[PDB]
Amino acid sequence: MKIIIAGKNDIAVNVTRWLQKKKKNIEIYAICNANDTGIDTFQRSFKKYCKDNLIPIISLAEAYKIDDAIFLSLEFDKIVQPSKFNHNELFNIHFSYLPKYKGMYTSAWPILNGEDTSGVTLHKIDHGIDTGAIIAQKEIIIQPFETAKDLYEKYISEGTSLVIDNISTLLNSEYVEKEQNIKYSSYYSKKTIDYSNLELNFSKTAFEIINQLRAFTFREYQLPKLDGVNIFLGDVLSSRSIMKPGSILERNDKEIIVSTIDYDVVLYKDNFKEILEACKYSDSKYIAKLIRAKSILFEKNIYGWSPVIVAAYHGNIELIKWLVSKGANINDRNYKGTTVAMYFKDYMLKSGDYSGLKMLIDLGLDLTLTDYKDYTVFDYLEKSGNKNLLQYMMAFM
Amino acid sequence: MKIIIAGKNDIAVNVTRWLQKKKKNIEIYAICNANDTGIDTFQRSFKKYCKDNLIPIISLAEAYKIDDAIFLSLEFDKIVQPSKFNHNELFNIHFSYLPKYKGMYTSAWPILNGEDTSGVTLHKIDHGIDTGAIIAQKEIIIQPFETAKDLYEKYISEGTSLVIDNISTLLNSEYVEKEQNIKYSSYYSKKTIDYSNLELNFSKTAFEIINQLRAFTFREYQLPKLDGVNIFLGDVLSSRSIMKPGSILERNDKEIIVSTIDYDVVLYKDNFKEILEACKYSDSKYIAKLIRAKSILFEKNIYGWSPVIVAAYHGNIELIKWLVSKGANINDRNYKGTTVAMYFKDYMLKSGDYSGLKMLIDLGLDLTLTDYKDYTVFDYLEKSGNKNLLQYMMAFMK
Numbered sequence: 001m002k003i004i005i006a007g008k009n010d011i012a013v014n015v016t017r018w019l020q021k022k023k024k025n026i027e028i029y030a031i032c033n034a035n036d037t038g039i040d041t042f043q044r045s046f047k048k049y050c051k052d053n054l055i056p057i058i059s060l061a062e063a064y065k066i067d068d069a070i071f072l073s074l075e076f077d078k079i080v081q082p083s084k085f086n087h088n089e090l091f092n093i094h095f096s097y098l099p100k101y102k103g104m105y106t107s108a109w110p111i112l113n114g115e116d117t118s119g120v121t122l123h124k125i126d127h128g129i130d131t132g133a134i135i136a137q138k139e140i141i142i143q144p145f146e147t148a149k150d151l152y153e154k155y156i157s158e159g160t161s162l163v164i165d166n167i168s169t170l171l172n173s174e175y176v177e178k179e180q181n182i183k184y185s186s187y188y189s190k191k192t193i194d195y196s197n198l199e200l201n202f203s204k205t206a207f208e209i210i211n212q213l214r215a216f217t218f219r220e221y222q223l224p225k226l227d228g229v230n231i232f233l234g235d236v237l238s239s240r241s242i243m244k245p246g247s248i249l250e251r252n253d254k255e256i257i258v259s260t261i262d263y264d265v266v267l268y269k270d271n272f273k274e275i276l277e278a279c280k281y282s283d284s285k286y287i288a289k290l291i292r293a294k295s296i297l298f299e300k301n302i303y304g305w306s307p308v309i310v311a312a313y314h315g316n317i318e319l320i321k322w323l324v325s326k327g328a329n330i331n332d333r334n335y336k337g338t339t340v341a342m343y344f345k346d347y348m349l350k351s352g353d354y355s356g357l358k359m360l361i362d363l364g365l366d367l368t369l370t371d372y373k374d375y376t377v378f379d380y381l382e383k384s385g386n387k388n389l390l391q392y393m394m395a396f397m
Numbered sequence: 398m399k400i401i402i403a404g405k406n407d408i409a410v411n412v413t414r415w416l417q418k419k420k421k422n423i424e425i426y427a428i429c430n431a432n433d434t435g436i437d438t439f440q441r442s443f444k445k446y447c448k449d450n451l452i453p454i455i456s457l458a459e460a461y462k463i464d465d466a467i468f469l470s471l472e473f474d475k476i477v478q479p480s481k482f483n484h485n486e487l488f489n490i491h492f493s494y495l496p497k498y499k500g501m502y503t504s505a506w507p508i509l510n511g512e513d514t515s516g517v518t519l520h521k522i523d524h525g526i527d528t529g530a531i532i533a534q535k536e537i538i539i540q541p542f543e544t545a546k547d548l549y550e551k552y553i554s555e556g557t558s559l560v561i562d563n564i565s566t567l568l569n570s571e572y573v574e575k576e577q578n579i580k581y582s583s584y585y586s587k588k589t590i591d592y593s594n595l596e597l598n599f600s601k602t603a604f605e606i607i608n609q610l611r612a613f614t615f616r617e618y619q620l621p622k623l624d625g626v627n628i629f630l631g632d633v634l635s636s637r638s639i640m641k642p643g644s645i646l647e648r649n650d651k652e653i654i655v656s657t658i659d660y661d662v663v664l665y666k667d668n669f670k671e672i673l674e675a676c677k678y679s680d681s682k683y684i685a686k687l688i689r690a691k692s693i694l695f696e697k698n699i700y701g702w703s704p705v706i707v708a709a710y711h712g713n714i715e716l717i718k719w720l721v722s723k724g725a726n727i728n729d730r731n732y733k734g735t736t737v738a739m740y741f742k743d744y745m746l747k748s749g750d751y752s753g754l755k756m757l758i759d760l761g762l763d764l765t766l767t768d769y770k771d772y773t774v775f776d777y778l779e780k781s782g783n784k785n786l787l788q789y790m791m792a793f794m795k
């Protein structure tokens with residue numbers, strides 16, 4: 001009944017928070033990665049979560065001496081001496097389908113290499129990097145429209161789940177170790193991609209080039225650029241410019257068209273900011289005309305505001321309905337964990353118009369959700385003494 | 398009526414040969430690569446071949462102007478601008494299973510990526526590099542141990558066959574085309590590997606690093622190095638050393654063991670030349686000791702002498718038998734087409750010891766083969782006046 005969670009970001013926090021609610025008797029210790037500066041971004045800080053839940057934050061030296069613990073690495077950044085532990089209960093979540101794509105930038109390389117699938121892998125920590133034996137594995141399908149950001153989010157959801165599904169095997173040490181194949185194993189270092197001098201390579205096929213776009217589309221770090229201008233995805237055209245690859249063929253307000261090894265490509269200029277503004281008040285027929293790629297309906301600005309969030313804070317229900325039919329999350333959250341329902345609560349208070357709630361509820365809105373300060377929409381309504389809207393909302397429970 | 402054959406190496410030569418025997422009627426024009434100096438090497442010079450067979454050599458500019466000729470490009474080094482022709486009977490043999498591995502280094506990249514198979518592809522020349530419609534294809538097994546060179550040699554062989562299997566349908570407009578899929582498409586430029594500063598990268602899996610050695614093992618151009626020391630393959634150990642990958646563990650004279658991302662690997666130093674000299678006169682026993690990577694027994698130096706060839710010239714019969722049991726080719730040739738049976742005949746002349754011939758015939762030695770001058774071993778003995786050894790060798794041929 002002891003566990004050491006060593007790692008970072010949302011998966012570290014999700015697994016930890018699951019444990020606290022569902023196995024309240026377990027003692028939890030944490031180790032944080034070097035560059036966890038204790039501040040939330042588009043990723044939760046695990047250091048911050050741990051300080052706020054009174055989870056003692058230990059070091060690796062101390063971890064070696066805590067004999068009855070299991071040691072769970074959720075993207076931990078430091079090599080560990082597996083034999084130094086007095087037990088063998090040492091696990092790691094790796095964001096790939098091992099033995100492929102060991103190492104770095106696993107939301108990028110599978111896409112770059114034109115993979116259809118990737119995965120998450122729960123394995124033993126061994127003397128190899130990402131090389132210890134497999135315990136549990138999840139194949140993830142990458143969709144042709146999906147970016148690095150989209151795939152990373154799958155890694156988060158699916159890795160969290162993978163841990164939770166297997167948590168008892170781990171806790172009881174009743175799991176089977178199957179050793180990794182050497183065959184088709186791959187590894188990429190941090191040197192494989194220079195994200196500080198990121199340049200698209202057009203001396204490639206059009207298939208490859210779109211796959212670069214997809215792969216490098218991870219807004220919160222960067223977007224790919226063509227001539228100082230951000231791009232959000234692209235498509236293959238039927239034309240084949242004789243121009244040397246890289247040559248810009250046309251240039252207009254919506255796009256750039258380039259010569260590749262084979263088929264020409266359209267790079268769509270990023271209009272995410274325009275779209276998000278429009279979402280305050282535009283109908284879906286107008287918004288649909290603005291979209292050149294589906295994935296952009298689910299992007300977020302620096303606060304974590306998505307199209308569905310903006311639309312909810314402005315009571316733009318007709319648009320919310322459409323967005324959800326395009327696959328948006330009716331319970332989308334910002335980087336404080338603030339839910340769509342919380343944004344709409346604000347619209348309901350500001351407008352006095354409460355009737356739309358049932359519409360959102362029927363779209364899957366969940367009022368029981370808690371933000372990162374652990375407050376529900378009902379809590380906020382009490383703090384602030386808006387008893388009428390509170391009673392109205394309560395009636396749905 | 399007419400056919401333009403554009404390219405280099407054994408593929409250009411063998412396809413051109415084939416057309417000359419099996420299609421004398423057809424006029425042949427030839428275009429050559431910039432790096433074909435007219436000197437044979439590990440591949441033949443198409444230019445030398447064309448000069449010696451009085452095949453006219455033309456330029457690509459001149460070929461653009463030749464209507465009612467088929468155009469076939471075989472490891473050609475120039476962009477063919479297809480609309481510059483006034484017809485559309487434009488064909489290329491590419492050394493990949495298209496649309497994978499378009500462009501360059503098709504002997505290295507697939508191995509580097511850990512592929513089981515590659516291919517040769519016969520297609521139309523269209524707009525784009527290796528993009529035109531597929532006519533015929535052959536899948537090719539890459540064996541786990543084979544080098545880039547071995548892979549290249551299969552490309553040359555299988556490419557030649559695919560052209561030969563389909564060349565009539567090209568001449569007679571009876572072929573079919575399927576457009577290439579976009580999906581799974583790849584291209585590698587000349588920049589994708591810098592042979593000049595070829596460096597090994599141990600920041601990789603063992604599998605990847607052995608695949609690195611394989612892909613960089615093309616001796617006539619280079620072998621991989623390590624601290625400047627040439628390397629002939631390696632194996633995957635079971636040790637998982639904690640030293641940051643690239644860290645050289647043990648040096649001896651046979652090998653250097655290295656730290657990887659996962660398992661350590663033994664690189665084997667290139668002693669090939671040492672093996673070649675020892676093959677003159679030493680026995681199975683001494684060579685088996687010299688040998689780490691078995692397939693080093695099938696390497697050739699820049700004239701095409703392998704272990705069996707050197708062994709045959711010095712009548713090292715027991716060494717020959719052992720080498721064949723390892724998988725050497727009993728009729729192995731150098732780069733002038735000179736066969737084992739030719740090297741042996743020189744031993745037979747010097748030693749007067751003819752007795753080992755029967756043993757060789759029974760391993761498959763073939764006395765009917767010709768070199769590139771088109772002489773059998775018989776023709777050489779008859780020219781030099783050795784009627785005796787001539788008739789002896791004839792008595793034993795099958």
Ligand SMILES: Cc1cn([C@H]2C[C@H](O)[C@@H](COP(=O)(O)OP(=O)(O)O[C@H]3O[C@H](C)[C@@H](O)[C@H](N)[C@H]3O)O2)c(=O)[nH]c1=O
Pocket residue numbers: 303305309310311313314334336337338342343345346380
């Ligand atoms: C989506 C959106 C939000 N806002 C305002 C409303 C919000 O109070 C402020 C900061 O946004 P936030 O940081 O996303 O809000 P936070 O996560 O602090 O949540 C707070 O504000 C929301 C509206 C409340 O339901 C919640 N209970 C508060 O904690 O920006 C706008 O002005 N326009 C918008 O489109």
Ligand SMILES: Cc1cn([C@H]2C[C@H](O)[C@@H](COP(=O)(O)OP(=O)(O)O[C@H]3O[C@H](C)[C@@H](O)[C@H](N)[C@H]3O)O2)c(=O)[nH]c1=O
Pocket residue numbers: 471472473474491492500501502503504505545549592612613614615618619
């Ligand atoms: C230049 C070079 C090549 N190689 C290997 C890798 C390569 O696949 C093989 C043959 O080399 P090449 O003849 O220079 O041409 P390559 O394989 O790059 O083929 C390309 O160029 C020719 C001219 C095209 O018609 C062909 N379709 C292309 O694939 O030898 C080396 O190992 N070291 C080298 O320095």
Ligand SMILES: Cc1cn([C@H]2C[C@H](O)[C@@H](COP(=O)(O)OP(=O)(O)O[C@H]3O[C@H](C)[C@@H](O)[C@H](N)[C@H]3O)O2)c(=O)[nH]c1=O
Pocket residue numbers: 700702706707710731733734735739740742743777
């Ligand atoms: C294999 C070998 C050959 N030699 C000699 C003998 C040979 O004539 C000369 C050049 O080698 P080569 O270029 O491989 O031979 P080439 O293709 O010129 O064929 C000639 O010499 C051989 C031995 C004759 O059977 C043949 N009939 C000749 O055309 O080098 C050696 O000195 N040491 C060797 O280990």
Ligand SMILES: Nc1nc(=O)c2c([nH]1)NC[C@@H](CNc1ccc(C(=O)N[C@@H](CCC(=O)O)C(=O)O)cc1)N2C=O
Pocket residue numbers: 073075076077078079080081082092093094103104125126127128129130131132188189190191599600641642
């Ligand atoms: N023994 C062990 N094996 C593991 O698989 C593992 C641990 N420890 N500890 C936690 C986590 C740590 N994983 C890693 C993985 C890569 C690097 C690393 O330094 N990579 C660099 C340099 C590679 C090199 O030295 O060439 C890179 O650029 O990739 C460090 C820690 N982990 C499992 O997640």
Ligand SMILES: Cc1cn([C@H]2C[C@H](O)[C@@H](COP(=O)(O)OP(=O)(O)O)O2)c(=O)[nH]c1=O
Pocket residue numbers: 104105106107108148152195216218221222
């Ligand atoms: C660091 C970095 C990552 N990425 C992408 C590819 C990664 O698989 C994904 C997740 O990165 P993350 O796990 O946050 O960082 P790192 O791999 O450096 O520890 O983010 C970028 O697009 N740009 C960047 O600068």
Ligand SMILES: [K+]
Pocket residue numbers: 056057058059
């Ligand atoms: K501490």
Ligand code: NA
Pocket residue numbers: 190191192193194195
């Ligand atoms: Na990097």
Ligand code: NA
Pocket residue numbers: 240241242243244245259260261262
């Ligand atoms: Na082009």
Ligand code: NA
Pocket residue numbers: 587588589590591592
């Ligand atoms: Na190069």
Ligand code: NA
Pocket residue numbers: 637638639640641642656657658659660661
């Ligand atoms: Na190592």
